[PDB]
């Protein structure tokens, strides 16, 4: 009797394995990926984006904006001492 037709019916091996699910994710995801990002934000020259550029970089954990920002509040109230005295 003639061989049956199972080997040639493939359309439930298109969901049949788990990486089909992953495939339909990364055919979208990686295809819509850019070569490099859009932009990281670091500066924009609003003149305080420069503050971010010098101090608040991705790799700058350096305490300098803190010191500067602290010193700003010291400059503020010290003048206000002379506003009240």
């Amino acid at each position: 009797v003639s061989t049956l037709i199972p080997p040639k019916v493939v359309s439930s091996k298109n969901i049949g394995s788990a990486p089909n699910a992953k495939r339909i994710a990364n055919v979208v995801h990686f295809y819509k990926s850019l070569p490099q990002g859009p932009a990281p934000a670091i500066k924009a020259n609003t003149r305080l984006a420069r503050y971010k550029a010098k101090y608040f970089d991705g790799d700058n954990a350096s305490g300098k904006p803190l010191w500067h920002f602290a010193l700003g509040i010291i400059a503020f109230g010290y003048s206000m001492e002379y506003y009240f005295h």
């Binding site: 495939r23 990686f30 990926s33 850019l34 070569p35």
Partner: protein, 57 residues
């Protein structure tokens, strides 16, 4: 799959990836964030099961 493999190799922001780029590549990002705020759960499960977390308590 060949083309997709090439796409992962030749395009992949991953040293400077922006969540804006992921929101753009999937509105699923904003959908889940909004659904979580609506749900009133501000601990997204699984986050600390493959990323860290720290606490004082």
């Amino acid at each position: 799959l060949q083309s997709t493999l090439d796409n992962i190799q030749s395009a992949r922001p991953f040293d400077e990836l922006t969540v804006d780029d992921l929101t753009k590549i999937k509105p699923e990002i904003d959908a889940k964030v909004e659904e979580m705020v609506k749900k009133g759960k501000w601990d997204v499960p699984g986050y600390k099961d493959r990323f860290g977390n720290l606490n004082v308590m």
